[PDB]
Design a protein around this ligand. Structure first.
Ligand SMILES: Cc1cc(O)cc(C)c1NS(=O)(=O)c1ccccc1
Length: 195
């Protein structure tokens, strides 16, 4: 009983430590046998995200060292994108962490996302590059449609034109692009606040 109560408080302390500095928080949890030091177990901890700031989760997933890269891979693997369209998948992924203005880190994260989306849905995009480019197209479209600071609201026809030639030199099916455009137009991305 006393061991359990002590462990519960130390877990809570570990979460607070993580929010101050992700690597120190994970270190405390691992060193106190509250979390196993495996990429999969760390990833599951971050995916659950209990009491964890989404900016802190993003920071940890964005680190360059081997273990953090492995955690990123395992974290993306916890996402189940089978039979979801690209927007549905992005809604889930983009809600799970936050990391603005770190280009190289976002590149790694979005490449991992694109690879996972395509593995889950092999018939949609034959090229993962197509998936990556279209993923950013949808993010850009969300901002263009829903941020009043941009006065050019691109219509469907413009969105279609902007994506020409990215499907192995051909175009994406028009209905795929329409479905993605309409999904974003009717429901903006829910993006985690800076926490
Ligand atoms: C997805 C998003 C869109 C925004 O308009 C603002 C933010 C903070 C986010 N999150 S974001 O971490 O900056 C980001 C994640 C993945 C790709 C691009 C950006």
């Amino acid at each position: 009983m006393s061991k359990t109560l002590q462990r519960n408080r130390k877990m809570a302390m570990g979460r607070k430590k993580f929010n101050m500095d992700p690597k120190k928080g994970i270190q405390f949890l691992v060193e106190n046998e509250l979390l196993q030091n495996t990429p999969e177990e760390i990833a599951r901890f971050l995916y659950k995200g209990e009491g964890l700031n989404k900016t802190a989760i993003g920071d940890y997933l964005g680190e360059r060292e081997e273990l953090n890269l492995a955690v990123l891979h395992a974290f993306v693997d916890l996402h189940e994108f089978t039979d979801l369209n690209l927007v549905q998948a992005l809604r889930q992924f983009l809600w799970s962490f936050r990391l603005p203005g770190e280009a190289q880190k976002i590149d790694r994260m979005m490449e991992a996302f694109a690879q996972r989306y395509c593995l889950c849905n092999p018939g949609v995009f034959q090229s993962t590059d197509t998936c990556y480019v279209l993923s950013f197209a949808v993010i850009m479209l969300n901002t263009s449609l829903h941020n009043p600071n941009v006065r050019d609201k691109p219509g469907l026809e413009r969105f279609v034109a902007m994506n020409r030639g990215i499907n192995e030199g051909g175009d994406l099916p028009e209905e795929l692009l329409r479905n993605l455009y309409d999904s974003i137009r009717n429901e903006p991305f829910k993006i985690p606040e800076d926490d």
